[PDB]
Every structure is written in C-alpha cells, then in structure tokens.
Amino acid sequence: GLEEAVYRNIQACKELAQTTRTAYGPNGMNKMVINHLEKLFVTNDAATILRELEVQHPAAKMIVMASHMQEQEVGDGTNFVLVFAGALLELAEELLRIGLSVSEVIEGYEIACRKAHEILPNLVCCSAKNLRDIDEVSSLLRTSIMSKQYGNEVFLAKLIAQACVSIFPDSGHFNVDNIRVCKILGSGISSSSVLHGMVFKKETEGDVTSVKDAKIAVYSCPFDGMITETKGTVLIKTAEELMNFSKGEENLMDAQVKAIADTGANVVVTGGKVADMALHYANKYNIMLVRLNSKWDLRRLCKTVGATALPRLTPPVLEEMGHCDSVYLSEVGDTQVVVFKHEKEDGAISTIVLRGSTDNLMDDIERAVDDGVNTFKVLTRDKRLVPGGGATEIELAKQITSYGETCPGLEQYAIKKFAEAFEAIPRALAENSGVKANEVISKLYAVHQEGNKNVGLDIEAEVPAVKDMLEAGILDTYLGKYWAIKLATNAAVTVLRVDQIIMAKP
Amino acid sequence: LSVFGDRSTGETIRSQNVMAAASIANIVKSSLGPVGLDKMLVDDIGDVTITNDGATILKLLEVEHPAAKVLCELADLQDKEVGDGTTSVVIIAAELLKNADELVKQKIHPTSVISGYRLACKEAVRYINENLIVNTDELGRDCLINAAKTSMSSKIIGINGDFFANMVVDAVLAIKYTDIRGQPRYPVNSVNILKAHGRSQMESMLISGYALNCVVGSQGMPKRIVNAKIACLDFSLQKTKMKLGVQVVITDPEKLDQIRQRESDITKERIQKILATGANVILTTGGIDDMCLKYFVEAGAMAVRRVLKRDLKRIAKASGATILSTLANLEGEETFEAAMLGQAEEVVQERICDDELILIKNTKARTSASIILRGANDFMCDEMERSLHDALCVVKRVLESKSVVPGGGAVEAALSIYLENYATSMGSREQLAIAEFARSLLVIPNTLAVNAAQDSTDLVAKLRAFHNEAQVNPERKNLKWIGLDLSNGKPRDNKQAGVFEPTIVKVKSLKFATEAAITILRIDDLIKL
Amino acid sequence: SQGIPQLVSNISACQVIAEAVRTTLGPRGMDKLIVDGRGKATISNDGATILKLLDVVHPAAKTLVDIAKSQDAEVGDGTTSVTLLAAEFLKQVKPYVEEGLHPQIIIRAFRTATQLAVNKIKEIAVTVKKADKVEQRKLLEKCAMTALSSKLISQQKAFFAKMVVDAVMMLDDLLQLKMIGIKKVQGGALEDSQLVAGVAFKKTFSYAGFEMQPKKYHNPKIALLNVELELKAEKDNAEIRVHTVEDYQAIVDAEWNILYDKLEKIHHSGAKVVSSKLPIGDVATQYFADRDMFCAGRVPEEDLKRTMMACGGSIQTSVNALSADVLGRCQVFEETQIGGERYNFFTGCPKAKTCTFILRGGAEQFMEETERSLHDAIMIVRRAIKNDSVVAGGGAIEMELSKYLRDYSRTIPGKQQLLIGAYAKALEIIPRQLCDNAGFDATNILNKLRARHAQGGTWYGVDINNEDIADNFEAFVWEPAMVRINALTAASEAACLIVSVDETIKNPR
Ligand SMILES: Nc1ncnc2c1ncn2[C@@H]1O[C@H](COP(=O)(O)OP(=O)(O)OP(=O)(O)O)[C@@H](O)[C@H]1O
Numbered sequence A: 001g002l003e004e005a006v007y008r009n010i011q012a013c014k015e016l017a018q019t020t021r022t023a024y025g026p027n028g029m030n031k032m033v034i035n036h037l038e039k040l041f042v043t044n045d046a047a048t049i050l051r052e053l054e055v056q057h058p059a060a061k062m063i064v065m066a067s068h069m070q071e072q073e074v075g076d077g078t079n080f081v082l083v084f085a086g087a088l089l090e091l092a093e094e095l096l097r098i099g100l101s102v103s104e105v106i107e108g109y110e111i112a113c114r115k116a117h118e119i120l121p122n123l124v125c126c127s128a129k130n131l132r133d134i135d136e137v138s139s140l141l142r143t144s145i146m147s148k149q150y151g152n153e154v155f156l157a158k159l160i161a162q163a164c165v166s167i168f169p170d171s172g173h174f175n176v177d178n179i180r181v182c183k184i185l186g187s188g189i190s191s192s193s194v195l196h197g198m199v200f201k202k203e204t205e206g207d208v209t210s211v212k213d214a215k216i217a218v219y220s221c222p223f224d225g226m227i228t229e230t231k232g233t234v235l236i237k238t239a240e241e242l243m244n245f246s247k248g249e250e251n252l253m254d255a256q257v258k259a260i261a262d263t264g265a266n267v268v269v270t271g272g273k274v275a276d277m278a279l280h281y282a283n284k285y286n287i288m289l290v291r292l293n294s295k296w297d298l299r300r301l302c303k304t305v306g307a308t309a310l311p312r313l314t315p316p317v318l319e320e321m322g323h324c325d326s327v328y329l330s331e332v333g334d335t336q337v338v339v340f341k342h343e344k345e346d347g348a349i350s351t352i353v354l355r356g357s358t359d360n361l362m363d364d365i366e367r368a369v370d371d372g373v374n375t376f377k378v379l380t381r382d383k384r385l386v387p388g389g390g391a392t393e394i395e396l397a398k399q400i401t402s403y404g405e406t407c408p409g410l411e412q413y414a415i416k417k418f419a420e421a422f423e424a425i426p427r428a429l430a431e432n433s434g435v436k437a438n439e440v441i442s443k444l445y446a447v448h449q450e451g452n453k454n455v456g457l458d459i460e461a462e463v464p465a466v467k468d469m470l471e472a473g474i475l476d477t478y479l480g481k482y483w484a485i486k487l488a489t490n491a492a493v494t495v496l497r498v499d500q501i502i503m504a505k506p
Numbered sequence B: 001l002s003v004f005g006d007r008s009t010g011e012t013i014r015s016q017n018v019m020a021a022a023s024i025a026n027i028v029k030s031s032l033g034p035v036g037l038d039k040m041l042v043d044d045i046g047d048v049t050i051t052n053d054g055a056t057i058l059k060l061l062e063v064e065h066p067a068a069k070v071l072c073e074l075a076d077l078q079d080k081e082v083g084d085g086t087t088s089v090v091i092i093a094a095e096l097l098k099n100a101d102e103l104v105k106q107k108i109h110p111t112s113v114i115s116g117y118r119l120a121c122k123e124a125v126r127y128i129n130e131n132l133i134v135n136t137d138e139l140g141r142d143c144l145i146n147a148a149k150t151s152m153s154s155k156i157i158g159i160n161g162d163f164f165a166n167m168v169v170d171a172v173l174a175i176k177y178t179d180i181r182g183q184p185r186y187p188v189n190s191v192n193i194l195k196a197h198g199r200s201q202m203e204s205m206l207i208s209g210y211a212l213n214c215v216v217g218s219q220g221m222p223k224r225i226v227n228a229k230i231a232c233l234d235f236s237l238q239k240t241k242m243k244l245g246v247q248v249v250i251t252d253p254e255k256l257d258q259i260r261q262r263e264s265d266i267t268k269e270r271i272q273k274i275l276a277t278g279a280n281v282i283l284t285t286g287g288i289d290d291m292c293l294k295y296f297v298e299a300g301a302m303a304v305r306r307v308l309k310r311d312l313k314r315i316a317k318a319s320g321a322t323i324l325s326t327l328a329n330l331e332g333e334e335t336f337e338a339a340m341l342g343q344a345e346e347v348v349q350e351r352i353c354d355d356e357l358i359l360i361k362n363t364k365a366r367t368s369a370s371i372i373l374r375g376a377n378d379f380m381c382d383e384m385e386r387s388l389h390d391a392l393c394v395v396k397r398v399l400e401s402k403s404v405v406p407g408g409g410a411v412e413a414a415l416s417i418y419l420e421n422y423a424t425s426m427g428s429r430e431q432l433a434i435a436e437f438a439r440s441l442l443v444i445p446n447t448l449a450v451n452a453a454q455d456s457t458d459l460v461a462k463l464r465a466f467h468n469e470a471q472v473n474p475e476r477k478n479l480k481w482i483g484l485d486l487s488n489g490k491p492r493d494n495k496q497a498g499v500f501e502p503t504i505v506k507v508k509s510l511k512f513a514t515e516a517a518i519t520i521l522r523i524d525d526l527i528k529l
Numbered sequence C: 001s002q003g004i005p006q007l008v009s010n011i012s013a014c015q016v017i018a019e020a021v022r023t024t025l026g027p028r029g030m031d032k033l034i035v036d037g038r039g040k041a042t043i044s045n046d047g048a049t050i051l052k053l054l055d056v057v058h059p060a061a062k063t064l065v066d067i068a069k070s071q072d073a074e075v076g077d078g079t080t081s082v083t084l085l086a087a088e089f090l091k092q093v094k095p096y097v098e099e100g101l102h103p104q105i106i107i108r109a110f111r112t113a114t115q116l117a118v119n120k121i122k123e124i125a126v127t128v129k130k131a132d133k134v135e136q137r138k139l140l141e142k143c144a145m146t147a148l149s150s151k152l153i154s155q156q157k158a159f160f161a162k163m164v165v166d167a168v169m170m171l172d173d174l175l176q177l178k179m180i181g182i183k184k185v186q187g188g189a190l191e192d193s194q195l196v197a198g199v200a201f202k203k204t205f206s207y208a209g210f211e212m213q214p215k216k217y218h219n220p221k222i223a224l225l226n227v228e229l230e231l232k233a234e235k236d237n238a239e240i241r242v243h244t245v246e247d248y249q250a251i252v253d254a255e256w257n258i259l260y261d262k263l264e265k266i267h268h269s270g271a272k273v274v275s276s277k278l279p280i281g282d283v284a285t286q287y288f289a290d291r292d293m294f295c296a297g298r299v300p301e302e303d304l305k306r307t308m309m310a311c312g313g314s315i316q317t318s319v320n321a322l323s324a325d326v327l328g329r330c331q332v333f334e335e336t337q338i339g340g341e342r343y344n345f346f347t348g349c350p351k352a353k354t355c356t357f358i359l360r361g362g363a364e365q366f367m368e369e370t371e372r373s374l375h376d377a378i379m380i381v382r383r384a385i386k387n388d389s390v391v392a393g394g395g396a397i398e399m400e401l402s403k404y405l406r407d408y409s410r411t412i413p414g415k416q417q418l419l420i421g422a423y424a425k426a427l428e429i430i431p432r433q434l435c436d437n438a439g440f441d442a443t444n445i446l447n448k449l450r451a452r453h454a455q456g457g458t459w460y461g462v463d464i465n466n467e468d469i470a471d472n473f474e475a476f477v478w479e480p481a482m483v484r485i486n487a488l489t490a491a492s493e494a495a496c497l498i499v500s501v502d503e504t505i506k507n508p509r
C-alpha cells in the first residue's frame, strides 16, 4: 500500500499546472467552466479557473494559497505562478531519481532565487515618464490587456487610459477601488465609454432629471403595504372598510414621504420594488428616486458617501444619511444612467461603462479591465519595466546557467534546474500558438548568445521565428516579475519540504 | 442455407478491403525516400533482417489476406517494366482506396469511381507529357554537376564538392555509346575506381582510360611500348596439369625426369609463336615461367602475370580481343594469329604511390575510364569509392530514358491543381472521382515531409502555392518546376538542383496504381471454402 | 480530459444539434414532433421552434442553442442556416485535429476565411430597385409567387400573390410578422379568400339582440372589457335564504339591480360598442337594444390584443374604470357576411399597423399548408423592400463562395491552405441538404452545379420544384446580402466557441 510516497505530492501539482499551461498567452485556449449554481460560462482567466475548480489535494493547495498572495501587492501574473512553480516541481523530480536528497534541492533553490533577484534589475530597459498622457499610458497597457481579450485591445487600451489619468494628480491614492465597472447591455464593445463619479446602470425611476441636494438616504425595503412593528390587528368586513384602508394607506404614505422632505433629502434609493402610487408621491415633493436591486450596488454606495440602508419603511433619521455634491441623469449610449458626480469636490471616482450583447462576454472584459487598472496600480511604486513575450525568461535562464556552471560543489544541480524552469514559459507560449516549442527555444538562445536582448516570441501561426520586443511595444512590469519569482519559489519550496501527509481528527 | 463456408457481402467487405490494403501502406510509409527508416523483418526461424529498401520489404512481407495479396503482385509488374518505383505505387493506390471508401459512405456507387479514375489517369499523363524536358544539357549547362553534388553530400567527400563532381560528370558522358540505331544508353559496367596513398584527397586525377592494378615485375624490360597488339590468354605458361582431381601415373624414376625436360622444351616452342604475332602486351592469369620472363626482357614484350579474370574480361572487351582458354587447338598447339589480338595506341607504366598501375589508351571499343582515388588512409578511400558508385548510378539512370521529368514531389503537386480544375469541367457524376484523385496524389509530398522532420502542413502547401501560379498567369515571376529539398526543409527549383526522374517510372506508377485500385474496388462479395 | 479528446467530445455533441434541424432546411422540409412532459404534441418545421423545446443538457451543445437564440431576436429566422453552417465547419477540420494541428490555427484561418466571404458577397451583390423598368408592385408579386409555388393553391397562385403585396402596403415603414393575422375557417371555395384592412374575429356571439344594433359607425368609442353580463353568470348572482315572503320579492329584484347597475355604468361612459371575452346574456343585449348601443361579446383575447394596439386603447377587467382614457377610436366600422358567419372589424385606426387575412377552403389541410407558406411569403416581401441589395437564394451564393475560397486557398502557403480549402467544402451543406430534403438526387445536382460555376455561372442554384438547375436571380428567388453576411459571421463565431474550448471544469455540486 505504498509505492513512492514523495511522487504523489508533486503529481497533484502537475495536474494543477496542466489546467493553465494550455490557457497561457494571447493564443491560449478558453475554458468551458460550470458554476456552482449550474450556469454555463466561457472564460480563460487563471483566477476564475481556481475559484470554480474546487481542488482538494492539500499539496497543490499551497500554490493556490500562493495565488491569493499573488493577488496581493500586485495584480499581474497569476498564470505565471501556476506555470513556473509547476515547472520547478517537475524538474525537481529528475534530481530525486538520481539519488539527490530533497534537502539539497531546497538550499540550492534559495541560492538561485536570490541570484535571480539581482539579474532582474539589470534587464530594466524603459520606464514611465510620468507625463499623465494618453499616448504614454496606452502604449504600456496594450500588453496587459493582451492575453485576456485578444483582438479587442484597441478599444480597451484607450478607455482605461482615460480613467487612470483622472486619478493620477491624486498622488498616493490611486487604487483599483476608485475605478468601478458597471455593465450595461447593448450593441458591443465599440459603444463603450468612460464617465466620472458613481454610475449605475439603472436610471432614475422618478421624473427628476437633476437635483443639487446633498442628503441621500437609502432604504432597502420595497414600497408596499405598511406593517406595524407591534401586532396590529387590522380586520375588514365590508367594501367601505376596505376603502378606508386603501385611502388610509395613501394618506400615511403621504406623511412618510413628507418626513423625507422635512429633513431636506431629495435623493432616495430603494432596494426593492416601488408601487405606482408611492412613485407619484416622490415626484410631488421633487425627490429623486433610483431603484437598485443589486446588493453589491447598494453596498458600494455605503462605502463611498456613508448612506446606510435601513430596514424600516422611510424613517426620518438625519444621522445615517450620506453626502454627495450633484446627482443627475445623463444619456450615454442610448441609455439613461444616474451620475453621482462631485462638483464641489476635486473628485477621485471614475466609472467605466461597458456595453455588450452577451453577459458571458461582458464578464471577461470586466476581468480584463480590472487587470488593466492593477497594472498601473503597481506603477504607483518605483517605475521599472521589463520586456515581455518570453524575452526576460531566456536571459534569466542564460545567466543562471552561466552562474551555476562556475560554482563548484553539489549545489550546482539545483541551480541548473532553476534556470530550465524559466524555459517552460516560452515553451508555454510557443505551444499555445501552434509552433514547435523546440525550434523557438533554439531560436531564442541563438540571438541571446550574440547579445541581441529584448527578443521575444513573434505571435504568428505561420512564422516560427522571433522579433524584437522593444520596437513591438511589448513591455511587462518588473514588480510583476519580482513578486512572481519570489512567491513561486516560496511555494515550490513548501511542497518539497513536506514529505508525507497524515490526517488527524479534531 | 447450407453452403461450404461463410458468406459476407455489402459495404462491409468494401470497408474491410481498404483497411487491409492501407495497413500495407503503413509498412512502406516511413521507408519512402532517401532518408527512409529501417524496419525489422522477423522470420519464422527467429532471426531478423534490417532492411530499409522498400522493394525488399514487400518481398518479405507475408500477410495472409486477399486484399493485401493484390498489392503483392504489383511489385512484380514494377521491376519487370522499368525496375524502380515500387512503393510509390502502394501509397498512391491505398490512399486512392481510402478516399474512394469515403465516397461509398456518401451515397456514390463505385461504378462512377472506376470510370472517373481511368479518365483522371489518362489526363494525368497528358499534363505530364506537356511539361517534360528532353534529355539534353550534357555539356556547358549545369543541371548535372549540381545533380550529382546532392548525392555526394552525405559522405566525407562532400567537403570539396566541386572537385569530385567533375570526375563523375565526364565519366558518365564518356561511357555513352548508341550501338542500336541511336538509342544511346549507359552500360551496367562503369569506370574502375582504384585507390592509393597520395598524401591527401585532392590528388585525384581523371585518367581517360582503364587502369590495371598489377605490377610488371622486372625492370630491364622497357615500360613504354608503341605497338598496338594486345594478347590475352587464360591458359598457364607455367607447368601444366591434367586436372586438379585427376592425375597421370608416373612409375619409373627416370620417366619423371624426362617429362620435366619436355616441360622446359615445350615452353621454348610456345614463346616462338606468341612473339611471332608481334604482341607485346601479354596478360596471363595462370602465371609466367621464370625462364620465359628471360625471353621477354630481350624482345621488349610487356608481360604481366597473375592478372585477375574479371579484370581481363574488361580488357578483352576494350581492344575487342577474344579470351583464349586453352592454347591446344584439339590436335596440336597454335597461337591463333590475328584473332585474339586487339589494337591500341599507348600503354604507360605510370608511377602511382604504393601501386604502380598499367593504363591503356585509345582502344577499339571500350568507352570506359578509371578514377584514381588517392588519399591518406584506407578509411577515407573506402568510403569515397562507394560515394562515387552511388553518384554514378544517379546520373546514369536519369540520362538513359529518352526524356525525363522533374520529380521529388514536383509531379504530384502540379497534378493536384490541374486535375481539380479539370474535374470542374466534366461533371456527370464523376467530378468527385477526379477531385479525390487530386487529393490522393498529395500523399507523396505528405509522406516526404514527415520523413524530412518538417511541418507537413507547411511543406506540402508550399509546393501547391508555387504550382498554382504556373496555371493562373504565364508570367515568369511564377515559380515553375519547384521540387522538394528534404535536407534543408525548403522548396527549390528542380532545374537548378538537378533532381530529375525518368518519365517511365512516373507514367507506369500512375497507370499501375489506378488499375490496382480498380480491382479492389470491384470486390463486393466474399466466398470462402 | 484536456487536449485532443476533449475536442472530440464537443464535436460529437455538435452533431446531435445539427441532426435535429438537418431535415427542416427549405420550405418543403420535413416536420418534427416534439412532445413535452404534459403530453401535448407539437408539429412544426420551423428550426427556432424545435430548438426552443429541446432544452439539451450538454454544455458544449448549449453554445449552439444560444447563438440561435440571438438570431431570432434580431433577424427573425434562419436558425437552421446558422446551425448547419457552424456544424459543417467542424466536420471538415475534424480529421485535422487528430493530425496534431493546434486549435488556435483553426481560429486564425476561420477569421481569415470569413473576411474573404464578406468581401466576395459585397462585390457580387446587385442592388435591384428599378431593374429593366418594372414597377415595384410587380416585383413583389413575382418573388412571393415562387414562395407559393408547388403548393395546393397553385391553381389560383396569381390571386394569392396579389394578397400578400396588398397587406404589406397597408402597414407603415415598421414592418413585422406578428402584426399580420391569419384566420382559418372552414367552407367556401379556394378563390373566395378576402382581405381585411384591420382586425377581425370569428364573432361566435349567438345570443339575442336582433332587429337592432346598427352596424354603421363614424367615430365610435371602442370599449374593451373582460366582464360577464349573463343572467346565470358565475360572478353576478345573489342567493339569500330567509323565511320572509315579501323579502322573496326583494332577492329577485336586487339580483337584477346588480346587473342593471353594472350595465348602467357602461352607458354612462358613452361607449357605442362594447367588447368582452366573457359571454353576454340576453337581458344585457336587450338593455343595449333599448338605449341604441352596439354589443358583441365572446371575442378571443388574442384578437383583442391586436385590437388594443390599433385602436389606441387598453383592456380593463372591471366596469368601474371605463372612461375616455381607455376607449378606442376608428373611422370605418362595417359588417360583412363572409362565409355565412357574422364578422366585426374596424378600419381606419390612428395606429392602424395591424391587419388580418382570412382563408377559405374545403379542407383544413388546404389551409394549414398555405399559412406555412404565407408567413414565409410575408417575410420575403418584407426583406425585399427593406434591403435592395439582394443575391440569389437556393444555394447560389454558397456555390459561388465555394469557388472563390478554393482558388484563393491555392495562393496562400502554410497551414491556411488545407483549412480554408476545407472551409469551401464546408459551405456546401446548404445546396446539398436542399436536394435531400426535397427528395432529389444530391449527386447529379451538385456535380452539375459545380460544373456550371466554373464555366461562368454566378447565379445558378438548386431548384426545389424541378430536378434541374436554374438561375435563381432571374427566377425571382432572392435573399438579402446583409442577412447572408450576418449568417456567415455568426456561423464562424459559433464554430470558434467550440474549437477554442479545450477543457471542461465542473464544480462539485
Ligand atoms: N503578445 C505578447 N507578446 C509578448 N509577451 C507576451 C504576450 N502575451 C503574453 N506575454 C507574456 O506572458 C506573460 C504574462 O502573460 P499573461 O497576460 O497571460 O499573464 P496574466 O494573464 O496577466 O496573469 P493574470 O492571470 O494574473 O492576469 C508575460 O511574461 C509576458 O511577457
């Protein structure tokens, strides 16, 4: 009942690498994933794969828990962890079959990890010029939106560029929470735009198109028949007693909307449905009524202006209301939306509205937009850029093998295997593009031998050659490559450190 | 029903006949081409023979199936017709059956497939014969020198390709003789390739004549002779015997002595009749007596002893002389004057290192020569001799048959475009028969691309992209006669590379493969007893 | 399963969706019987009707359903054209998958061959507006004639061709299929099919009220109700049980004043005619005959749904809410005797965008065969006035694209040659299935059609009437170019969503 007992901890992580190796790159394949609520979904993002695939082996859960740390401090390269650290554990199995101990590979990996953190600042070619221009920003964002939505990057690189420039004067406060995404059904991606302030997809149900009131109250309860918090035994016998309750319901709701006018609040948000007679009372006292059925659309407004959602039927409470500058309506893309604009304030809220005919298609654009904001959320720190497309993966594999050859002793075996694990990432890019991977690696090492740096893969099915990444405009993030190498090495050293797994009762 | 076996009919015998025939094509799929892979031929005894030649594969392949037994006989119709081509018939006809098997499932009767294949075959010979090349360009214009240089690249001789390709080009054009009504062919016998140690491989010389690897022995006899008479004989001038197994009886001791004095006296009589003819070139297989060599250094006859028998058959064919087996003419002893003698011009004993050779010049009818492969050791000389023999047969088999065709995938790629446009001109339930005939011819570059370690979807499609432009517009910017260089993995022109194939190996391959695909497609019922 | 065999499991689930709508291609296609869980049978030849009722459980098969779900909402039909075209794109590249070709190379050549299909169609599409100096009324009479050809009304096909071109003229620029109604009543000859400019119903109201109720009205107030005005009604009754014998007179009188006060609110609103889904009793038709009011009950709700849109009113269940805000208006209100039955209809509405076409005949199969051809003939003459740049139907544009994508494939080296060359044979499913669904010989027609396209035939297609080939551009069988573009781009996009999928992830639930 025991065969190897050290190989089964690695084979569980090799299956986790295979679910994202073919899904790597701009030529990567999509995944037909099934939601837990029985919903069909088509995506190719690496973070949405692990969220739905409930992996159960705890040896492969270390790389998944490393992906949750990969989502922190950087929003770039979750697929880089599942490919590179998967190639670390696959190449480490060739050393253990010879007779090498597992503790010798551990100290040899941490030696080559600190050596790879010194060669990576030497490969920084360009940097951002901090001009806050749409030509400088969209030139670097065109590589990050690639490998998410290929072919439609010409419309996505300009829209997120117009959102992040409006936040860059607010220095030290740029984040992904300031740029929100609201999806509106429409024609396609060509009709999409970008707006300022908080934009919701639902229009104002009332007849007010513009109001300058600051007091905003949110009530999650729908507009229906009022129920007393006490017992409240209400009995009806005849038709005249039913009309006394029907007219008395409208008369009490007339005093309910009058309490909103007494506190000086002309903006009300209702989570549930609104009755037709209660909608007439809101338009009488010039009150803007916006219906928001989504709970995440209601929770977004409490964390911005402070207006809380109360369960009671319109309570006149002055303490739990929010504050905004100007709430109005705007007609963009043949659809009226509500804008929570900040006129007196300088403003740091931007909303990118996305249009599309398929909800399964518009959700993949939302993961491509939030990964585009997270590329420049990293660039609020020290600006360093590295060439992409497998350009840095060969030069880092060239210097480590040159370093491990000159170093004598038993530690030269784990350093040489640390460089060949970087070769799997151009092997993942060449295989997904329909090109023989053994020819591109030989074409990459032949041009890097002569000193022609910044050379990556030519993205073409018919051309197995290479091209320059500096003239092509392909650039990655150095901090995106810095935390990816450190977290994948710390994850792959954790799986090799654990030998056997024993179940225990609580 | 009570019969003497099992009966099976319908389309299930059509699908079983094409699966048994295409499985034989997989036996000769990887072995196609000059880079073909070896395959193990397991015998019933237990030993195995490693052969890569496809003609020897189908001879030893024994599959007890009647569908596979049909493809066994076409190997006998291929060597008896031309002598080459064999496995190219098998891959074409099996892919012809596999595409026709898809037509049976597509509600097409095979009668339209059989009549459509014969019209597709006859139009294939018409498009080939309209795009041929006459056997010419022997001197002055290269598609030759470069033709034999590709065959010479696999060995160590390919470092200096231009030096050794000139030795085989002028040797092929030297052995040309019509001999029947203006045929000219090339014989199975060729130049004799000798070797020596001439301190490097660059000291090879193109000798315009046969060179004998024998040493004349004595030095007092002169090595330069002017007379033309050449004598060849097989009987020994040494002491003769009756038989190796039958002997004569000798009883008296003095009787033994007088037959040795008679042997010394009858050697004086035979040398009087040989030198009376004036023949100085004396070549003897059985050896020359020691006192008989004394008479040759004073008369000036160039006597060579211990000559090989197979070397003397090319010498007597050179000067037109007759080989004399016995000197006794059934009652006495004569030399057969003016019968066993030829004519020549000059025989020089050239000083070659480690083997002083005998060269003959301007004989009666020889047309042969010799190449002295001077080198450094026996390793580089033995590998260069088989490289000259392999480069000789490449230029020989091309320049025989009276016209040639640029082959190596250039024939079938051009036929895949013309026969498709011809298929759209006929109709009448045979368009799909000719359109699948064009796609079935594409397996010849398809198996050649997978054996050349290249992408088969790119290398075959690069052949059809160039051959389509020859049919669209007749402008010279269209690449014409584009062959397939399997070494570099890039298509080139066959006229510049010199890759040529005979027409009779290309015509009879398309003729035999369609007649073999017709016979298997006509099988609709199986009867066993 | 990731790689090659996951694509084979998705390429076999594509066949079971195409086979459900393979035989329904063409007007003479075979019908399908789909039975739900309740036990009702549904016979339809429409491809959108079958795919809505299948509800397939396979995840790779749900992609081709949702593409046809987007097609019926925008274009209107042609769900079997985008299904067989997207299916045949996969069956040609299926032997290329096992060879080792990457599925991204299938994507890169599908985006190229689709863009060549758009440029070839727009260069070959001819705008037919006033060709050969003909009237536009005669052009729709010829194109609707081929839709009714080889049918049961071929004896009077010239009369039925004039009926479709008159119904499309009475509407505005906003043309739709659901605005036209088709009624099926039994009796009469075949040539007695009249036309109604507005909404008409069968009018099964056979209660009392004769020698009154004038059928002529200039501007009446159309009342739309759902109330019952019967004496033995289920909602208007009174049952009071007592011993008092003078109260016995009161319970019969107060039961009458319940119906009388509900009838008094009708005349107080000023409604000239009243309509109701529930039947109307004889004492309510007697009350309207005394006050000179028209009444006609027992009308269907679907006939009322086309009436409230045209008259400009709305349906109100109760009689208390009857006022001038919900009363409809019209200009012509007459009464006919078509087929011996009474027929009420309105003509000259301010929102007159709906009509009704009554059919006559001696057999019900002579009527249901026509209404399948009538709805197709309506959408043909709707597409003719909408899109002027049209091409020949019947597989004529598919055989021309198979010629253009074949010789261009031989000019492109690489992996795109053997794929786009297979893309040309994948477009042959439209003229091939037109022969097998019509019962012809698919071998002799397609071999004659491809031989005609090489000699110069650019508008020849498959004739569904005869077993011949004919120029469908000259035979007035047309299809718009923009629908053929939208059917080709949706077929390659649906074929892309099956090829690009490489692994299926199922959450454990
Ligand atoms: N078109 C391209 N040209 C050059 N390099 C590319 C291209 N596309 C991807 N890459 C390379 O792929 C790696 C990042 O690719 P990718 O966009 O798949 O990661 P990611 O999807 O952003 O990660 P995450 O899953 O966290 O979003 C980089 O090393 C980059 O060099």
Ligand SMILES: Nc1ncnc2c1ncn2[C@@H]1O[C@H](COP(=O)(O)OP(=O)(O)OP(=O)(O)O)[C@@H](O)[C@H]1O
Residues within 6 Å of the ligand: B031, B032, B033, B034, B036, B054, B055, B078, B083, B084, B085, B086, B087, B088, B089, B407, B408, B409, B444, B448, B484, B485, B486, B499, B500
């Ligand atoms: N010089 C050349 N360059 C490129 N291809 C060549 C050349 N010579 C031959 N070929 C290819 O090699 C193939 C010949 O294969 P091979 O010699 O292994 O068997 P074969 O001769 O076809 O069998 P058989 O003797 O029955 O005909 C031909 O199809 C031809 O296309």
Ligand SMILES: Nc1ncnc2c1ncn2[C@@H]1O[C@H](COP(=O)(O)OP(=O)(O)OP(=O)(O)O)[C@@H](O)[C@H]1O
Residues within 6 Å of the ligand: C025, C026, C027, C047, C075, C076, C077, C078, C079, C080, C081, C146, C147, C379, C393, C394, C395, C430, C434, C462, C463, C464, C477, C483
């Ligand atoms: N009279 C005809 N002759 C030949 N082919 C026809 C004829 N009518 C229709 N077709 C074929 O039927 C196909 C259209 O099928 P179908 O009628 O189900 O869709 P549609 O109603 O035209 O589309 P839509 O839903 O956009 O109106 C076309 O591709 C055409 O080739």
